[PDB]
Amino acid sequence: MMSASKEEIAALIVNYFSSIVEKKEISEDGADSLNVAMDCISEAFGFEREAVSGILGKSEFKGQHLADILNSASRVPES
Amino acid sequence: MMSASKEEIAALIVNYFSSIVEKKEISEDGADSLNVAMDCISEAFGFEREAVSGILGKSEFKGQHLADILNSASRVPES
Amino acid sequence: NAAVHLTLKKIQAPKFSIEHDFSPSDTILQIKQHLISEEKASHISEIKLLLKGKVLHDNLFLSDLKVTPANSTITVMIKPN
């Protein structure tokens, strides 16, 4: 959309993980793994875990998850 | 194109981080953090980071990255 | 034997790295306690250890740690919740 900067992508990544655990699409085994990984990602790029709501707002990715976005990507391999 | 499978999305996520560490786009600390983060994603979804090439090779994301895909993907919030 | 050699490394700056020998009868909680003793952490709840992506819970014993000469490094994550 805009530029797909590290912060733009990061927000969608953590949002995707949040979506998975929300509707419980993963077992508690991997749930805690993504739980901590999400925080590591947040610290790496320099943003708060609970600040994802603001990032999705300031960026033009509101109402869009990494899943739905990729789901709309009809990449055709012309190998 | 063939929907958005969890493993396919995860493959792009780890690939994205790999594309960052391959050219040291992230700091020394971030690199270490991303390394373990990718490991967590791999074990949680049920795949290996060293097998990312095999996943992308099957998926319609071969030769693409999470960055370029998200960059091209553009949605306009009518609000 | 009882000599459980573990390497504690923090991925987030400052990236410290210390090696010590523990016991198979010790739990992940013991490592956390040890980390605080070495003045590398403040609270137990801030210390989240991981191994190959798998989160190491306090109830986990060091005897169940799948640590080999290759992955003898434990991921030390420290965050205020």
UniProtKB/Swiss-Prot annotation, chains A, B:
Chief place of localization: cytoplasm
GO molecular function, one term: identical protein binding
GO cellular component, one term: TRC complex
GO biological process annotation, one example: response to heat
Compartment annotation: Cytoplasm
Alphabetic keyword roster: Chaperone, Cytoplasm, Phosphoprotein, Repeat, TPR repeat
Function according to Swiss-Prot or TrEMBL: Co-chaperone that binds to the molecular chaperone Hsp70 (SSA1 and SSA2). Regulates Hsp70 ATPase activity. Required for recovery from heat shock.
Miscellaneous section: Present with 9424 molecules/cell in log phase SD medium.
Family recorded in the similarity comment: Belongs to the SGT family.
Subunit annotation: Interacts with HSC82, HSP104, MDY2, SSA1 and SSA2.
UniProt name for this protein: Small glutamine-rich tetratricopeptide repeat-containing protein 2
Gene field: SGT2
Curated annotation (Swiss-Prot), chain C:
Role, per record: Required for efficient mating. Involved in the production of alpha-factor, the KAR9 and TUB1 location to the shmoo tip and nuclear migration into pheromone-induced shmoos.
Protein name: Ubiquitin-like protein MDY2
Part of the full-length chain shown: 71 to 151 of 212
Transmembrane segments: none
Residue ranges of domain Ubiquitin-like in the record: 4-81
Quaternary organization: Interacts with GET4.
Subcellular location(s) per record: Cytoplasm, Cytosol; Nucleus
UniProt miscellaneous comment: Present with 6510 molecules/cell in log phase SD medium.
